[PDB]
Amino acid sequence: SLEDLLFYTIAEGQEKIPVHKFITALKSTGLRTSDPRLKECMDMLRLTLQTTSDGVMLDKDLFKKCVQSNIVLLTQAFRRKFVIPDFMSFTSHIDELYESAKKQSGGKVADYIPQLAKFSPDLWGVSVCTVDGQRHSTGDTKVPFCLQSCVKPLKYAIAVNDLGTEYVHRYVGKEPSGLRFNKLFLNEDDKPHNPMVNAGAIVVTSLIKQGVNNAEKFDYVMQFLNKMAGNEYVGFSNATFQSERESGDRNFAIGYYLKEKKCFPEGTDMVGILDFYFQLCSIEVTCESASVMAATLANGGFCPITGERVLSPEAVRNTLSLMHSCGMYDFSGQFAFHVGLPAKSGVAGGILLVVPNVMGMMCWSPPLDKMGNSVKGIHFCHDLVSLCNFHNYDN
Amino acid sequence: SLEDLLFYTIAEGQEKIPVHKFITALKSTGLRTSDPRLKECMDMLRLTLQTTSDGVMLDKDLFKKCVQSNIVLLTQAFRRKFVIPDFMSFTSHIDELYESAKKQSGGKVADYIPQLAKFSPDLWGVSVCTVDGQRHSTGDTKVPFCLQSCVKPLKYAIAVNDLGTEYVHRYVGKEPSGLRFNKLFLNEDDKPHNPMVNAGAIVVTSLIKQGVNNAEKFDYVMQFLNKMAGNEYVGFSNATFQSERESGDRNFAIGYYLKEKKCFPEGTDMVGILDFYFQLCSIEVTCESASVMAATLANGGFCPITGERVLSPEAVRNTLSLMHSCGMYDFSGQFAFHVGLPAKSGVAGGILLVVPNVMGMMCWSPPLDKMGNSVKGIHFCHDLVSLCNFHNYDN
Amino acid sequence: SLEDLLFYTIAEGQEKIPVHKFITALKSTGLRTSDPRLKECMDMLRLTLQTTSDGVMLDKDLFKKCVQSNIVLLTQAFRRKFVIPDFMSFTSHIDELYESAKKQSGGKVADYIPQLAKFSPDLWGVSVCTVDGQRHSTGDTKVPFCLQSCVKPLKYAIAVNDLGTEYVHRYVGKEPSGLRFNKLFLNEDDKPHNPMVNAGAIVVTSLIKQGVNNAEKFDYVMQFLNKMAGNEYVGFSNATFQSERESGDRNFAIGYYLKEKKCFPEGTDMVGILDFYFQLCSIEVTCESASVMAATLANGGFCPITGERVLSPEAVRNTLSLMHSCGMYDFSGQFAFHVGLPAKSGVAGGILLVVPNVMGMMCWSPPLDKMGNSVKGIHFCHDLVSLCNFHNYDN
Amino acid sequence: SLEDLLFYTIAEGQEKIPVHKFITALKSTGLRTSDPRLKECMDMLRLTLQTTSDGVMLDKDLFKKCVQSNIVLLTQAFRRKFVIPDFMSFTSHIDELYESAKKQSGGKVADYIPQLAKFSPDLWGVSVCTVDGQRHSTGDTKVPFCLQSCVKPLKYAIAVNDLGTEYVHRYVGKEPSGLRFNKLFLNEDDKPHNPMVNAGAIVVTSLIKQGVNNAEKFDYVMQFLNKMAGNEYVGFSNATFQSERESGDRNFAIGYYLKEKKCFPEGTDMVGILDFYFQLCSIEVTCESASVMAATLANGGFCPITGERVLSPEAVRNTLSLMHSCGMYDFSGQFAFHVGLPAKSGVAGGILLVVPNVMGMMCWSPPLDKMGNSVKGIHFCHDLVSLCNFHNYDN
């Protein structure tokens, strides 16, 4: 049977296979023992460990009993039918790129609020989540940090998922602005140029769950992020929020400018919307959870490690299309010339990368360049395409 | 004696001069019986009327007794040594220009707040106050209306009077912006282009009576306006204030923009300053009092009908210099090409005109042209220069 | 004819009656030449003065022509059929009481805001407006001052006039509280004890012109006050308003208390209502206009000097009933024991008195007693009843 | 040697002791393998497991090497010299009391905000942290929930720790109020009766880290809580915060009342302080971390599982003294009559208990009784004293 073939493949001309050998073989592919899809499996393994004092042998029966539950994924995992047959080489390349970027230093940790100018200019982490569940991480990849501007794609997606592309873009433009993210001007039809600049993001935040109050708005967005991350860490930084809602004079200017030109739906409280905008900017993540969010965007709108649909196909398509042409603001043209991938960056360090149909990725380093991007993150993104051929127009 | 010469001049080969004849002769020149400088005089006249049942004759003694108090002004008034020897012809020209402008119609009363779109498109008033006390008025020249933007010169003057030109312009520019009054941009050194656009006016309002609260600020400004108007009507429109503080999204945007670029003194509440700005815009006047304010600006900084110094010579000079090049915003170049006078206008109707060393003038008409100026006011200003040769560069 | 009888009554065995004699005879009764009901009359008199150089005689024709317009009031005025046949004696008593109260001194001008602690402790004015137009004033009776708490009756009346007693008292109680005006507690059914304490007044202010914004609310109330005052001075003190909205911590506490116990109609902004409450407290009056307002309350809800209905009979009845039992707060029982009249008082000085079916009265003196009432006002009210028998239960 | 004696005690007439036997023996006492004080120890054990494929024997050398680091605690733990020699019986009693309280049902989950009326009326957890590190938990003891009112003691302690008892009580009273927690009245010297009612808590929150902004205030308090909890879970509920800052009309009333009676230090923003108060109420904990906080209070102000001093002895003494007489508000007298322990309760469920010199405890159950306390929590507290003799006045 297929289970017998798998057992023989794991074994080497022997009779019994220990549990630890099976676990190591599973983890070598790239899957994590904590994968939700494997939950039942591991549970049974624990039930097997509850009997023996130390170590247990699975010859025919217990292995089949444990592997019987949802026997689809394991066959592909051990038949090397994923999107990256050898993840242990791509992980080595990720490590080499990480080391190469670590030598690069010299920047300026953001200091417009005290919660950003408290990270040492040495934290540096990279996390990759493949579209088929393979995950790898290297560096400070569990220190919480605020998404800041990395949430703006995640916002826009959600709106189009709940309302639709037609209705949503009845409010925001679709074309690169050509100027800085915080510039106070609108497109030809007095609309934000796109939902990636601050004006369009402020507009988009007002199309989400209209009518209900900010508690319900925040709860709805948090639930969406939780199942988009695959039930990974999504939190809130109240100290960052309290600093940000006090130093947001430019965003207040933008909000009033938008309110004067009638850029909001009917029946919208603009100052409350702006507070809700700061709150969504103050959501904490780790490289692990943000990599899973990017993988969700890259895959189909389905979660990679739960197989759950979170966004419409149209939402993901619209999200990647706008990220490619507006993700780095007036640097996107030059970021697309050398990387050619959908990407977003926040002033707290952090590059969110989508390799569509391959993976999502998060690269966090607090120190910034003059453009507002982490130096190591930009270096890593530049080198990854030159060493792995991910540019969209490569052959 | 000089009093005897004046009495003979008033009389025509007779013995006694009745009081009414003297009053008519005085009013023919242009002075008003309610002139503060003549106060004592009129009081004595009343003391003379308290005795006789009807009519009284002044031959030698009573005339000298009444005229003795402050006998300087009367000699100049009856010797035709004022700045306009015959005011009864300039008044006729003012009436002709008023009639000519009345025939002109077709505009749009301001309707962005309900307190402006309640004046019939037929109110039309003109008031002139000469630098030497002569006053004339024609039309609806006692209906209250908000100064709105006509206060911005009066603001700036006051600041330079209390602080100084150097300190004041350490905060605002000195050059025409080239764009609209409410555009959200600053000069080369991130400063308002001038104190006539909304940004520079918002900055100037924060240099006045710093430290104290808005009650004391408002009281100080009101006192300054009261002695600048010569103790004429200066009031407040609370309904207009309540409407304006609710529809001021553009000014809120400008204020937050200025707060982000550090365009205020140290220790300034910007939202409180903005409320104080709306309040100063909500001060009511009549053509009579605003004409006296303009006469004060035109004269020396001294009041015309009280002989009291209200502003420094530097304040008046700086005020007229900035009004000429910025009074009509991006229309000033064309307003200075055909009128060549310091002028200011508000969306509530109302043109404040200074003819330096000659007079001040107020022309109120609610209906506006597309530029934002009263049609009849602009017509009157254009025709006054073409019929009286007031252009600064005329010969 | 009746006109001939009046002419003979004015004359004393003569042929012609001069205009000044007629004016003096009219003013001796108590009516003012500026009475709106007499407007046309005076106009014709001016038309008569435009011809003769000085003085004019009315024998038969011109007198009839001038008196023909609205010949009802004059017959009653000269037949001594008013409510006070000899007003020249009640005026003498008012003057004696004024002089008696002036000798009394020693108090404490309110100093919780700077706009109240700026009046010298010597201003002292009294104004009386009879239900039939007779008016008398003595002292500083044209200096503006804020009504403050004297508006609370005027508020409540208006609500019941527009909504009805049943609906209005569905929200506020009807019984004396027994405690201070600013105590933070409610009646048995979690309602304000009455609309004279601050809680009930805050509730009443929210029943007026619901739905519209504060500009329209303020305009509506101002119009109501203007025709209630008979087109006398009703203004706004922006400096007092700005001080009062900053030192109103007790009223903010009361408003939040009321908001938590659900003491407002549905769809009410409590902080906006509180601002509107401060604004209505910041309306300026003079003894002249407030006396006319009190006369309107006393008469029928009709204006005394315009013959215009301003409030429903139910509104006036309910207003006087609540003023009698709650006008002085926990002093009313003792104020009704010695005066027995509807009265209200404000911390800016000012006693508003109603003698129902007789007159209205305003007595202004800034210095306060420990209870919060002007010393001279309380003295005048005590002495007026002891010298003129106005107590409601007198025989 | 002492290590040899310990090894013999662990062993039973054998040569070698396996690691798992030692771990089980250690955990039987009550200590947790994750104890920070044992950190180094466990690390070495891992270094021992890295060599052998499965299982390892420690005869003389490795046991001494692992136990050498900080060999003080183990001797007391295995000599039964802790404060509870047999924790496995107190844990059994805790389980019996938990089961007894679970059978009790019938209450009303708080529903004044939606974040409280979302917990099923079946969550029920109890956690005990002994003063010497022993810990036990039963039930849903890791579900986050807001402290709400359980933070008020933790607040007050901190203030007295940083400023001092004399200074702190210069602002708040020291005596039971006799009325409800949210009553709007003050003591004889216009001061909050104590820092356990809402007024005194609002005052106390304004004495903490004065001058700095709410970001720094929140960070300081969070750090204090983190080392008071022993580096256990301390978080924030932004949704609860956003709901609570919108439904806090009573607390706004109390704050304005306190601001009017001058109950704050000089230079305090009361609305900002109130927001900071809501934020501190919105801190999430679990029964595990709150039990450790209570143990810190009970012990000496030293942490139980880190041996670190967090508060002054005066702070802990003052905290327990005020909790005993004010912890349950106007129920304390009856709570002290049957329990006689320092305790605090919040409307989110949750009883914080201190058994001074013995332990701290947290008992969470959302459904409330009419008094505002969790039914199962009150039942557990009543039964614990009747079955274990913890009442302060027992013999």
Author numbering:
A (entry chain D), B (entry chain B), C (entry chain C), D (entry chain A): 138 to 532
Can you quote the paper on this entry?
Glutaminase catalyzes the first step of glutamine metabolism, converting glutamine to glutamate, which enters the tricarboxylic acid cycle. In human, glutaminase is encoded by two different genes, GLS1 and GLS2.1 GLS1 can be alternatively spliced into kidney glutaminase A (KGA) and highly active glutaminase isoform C (GAC)1. Glutaminase, especially the GAC isoform, is highly overexpressed in various cancers for the utilization of glutamine. GAC can be further activated by anions.
We resolved the structure of GAC filament at a resolution of 2.9 Å. GAC forms filaments with tetramers as the helical unit. Sequence alignment shows that the amino acids involved in the helical interface, F355, F373, N375, F378, Q379, and Q416, are highly conserved in mammalian glutaminase. In the Apo state and the Pi bound state, the activities of Q416A are 0.26 times and 0.63 times of those of the wild-type GAC, respectively. In the highly active filament, the helical interface is located on the catalytic core of GAC, and the tetramers are compressed.
